[PDB]
Each structure stands twice: as C-alpha cells, then as structure tokens.
Amino acid sequence: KKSTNLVKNKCVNFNFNGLKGTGVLTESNKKFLPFQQFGRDIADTTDA
Amino acid sequence: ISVTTEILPVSMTKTSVDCTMYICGDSTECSNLLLQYGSFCTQLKRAL
Structure with a gap:
C-alpha cells in the first residue's frame, strides 16, 4: 500500500487499516486504553 | 361546587425516513444493487 497526508474538517474517503x-x-476528546484500537456505537458502527 | 380534571391526547410526532441511508449507508454498490428491487420507498413516503 501507499500513504497520504491527513485532512480534517472536509468530507472525504478514508481507508484506515482496511x-x-x-x-x-x-479531533476527539475520548480516552482509550493501550489494548484498544477503535470504538463503536449502539449499531456496531465505528465512531472513533 | 367541585372541580375535576380530564386529560386527552390530540396530536402525535411526525417522522420521516430515508431508504438508502438506513439500508445501504455510505456504500454505492449497495445502492446500485438496491435500485433493482422495487418502489417500496414511494409507499413508505406516502404513508408518512
């Protein structure tokens, strides 16, 4: 694969690790733990 | 001389739904596949 700079505050396509x-x-104010990678909402769709 | 209270509902909240966002979401392939089923969306929109 390749890599690209990170853009924020614009509606874009993203491919984060597949x-x-x-x-x-x-930018997020959430606090994760060292064994976590992403979070989820009620409908099991990624939010962070 | 007596005063009594009675309560009666009148109205109800109004809702609207979107087909493609709920069923498919942010995937175009699902939209192109869903275009070949029917016109259930028209019925749902008319009822609402």
Whole structure:
C-alpha cells in the first residue's frame, strides 16, 4: 500500500487499516486504553 | 361546587425516513444493487 497526508474538517474517503468509509474527521476528546484500537456505537458502527 | 380534571391526547410526532441511508449507508454498490428491487420507498413516503 501507499500513504497520504491527513485532512480534517472536509468530507472525504478514508481507508484506515482496511476499514473503508466516507465522512468527516474531527479531533476527539475520548480516552482509550493501550489494548484498544477503535470504538463503536449502539449499531456496531465505528465512531472513533 | 367541585372541580375535576380530564386529560386527552390530540396530536402525535411526525417522522420521516430515508431508504438508502438506513439500508445501504455510505456504500454505492449497495445502492446500485438496491435500485433493482422495487418502489417500496414511494409507499413508505406516502404513508408518512
């Protein structure tokens, strides 16, 4: 694969480690743990 | 001389739904596949 700079606050396509999606990315105030990679909402769709 | 209270509902909240966002979401291939089923969306929209 290749790599590309990170853009924020614009609706874009993203491919994070095989996770494909379309949306806008924003800085987060959430706190994770060293054994976690991403979070989920009620409908088991990624949010962070 | 007595005063009594009665309560009666009148109205109800109004909702609207989107087909493609709920069923497919952010994937175009699902939309192109769903275009070949029917016109259930028209019925749902008319009822709502």
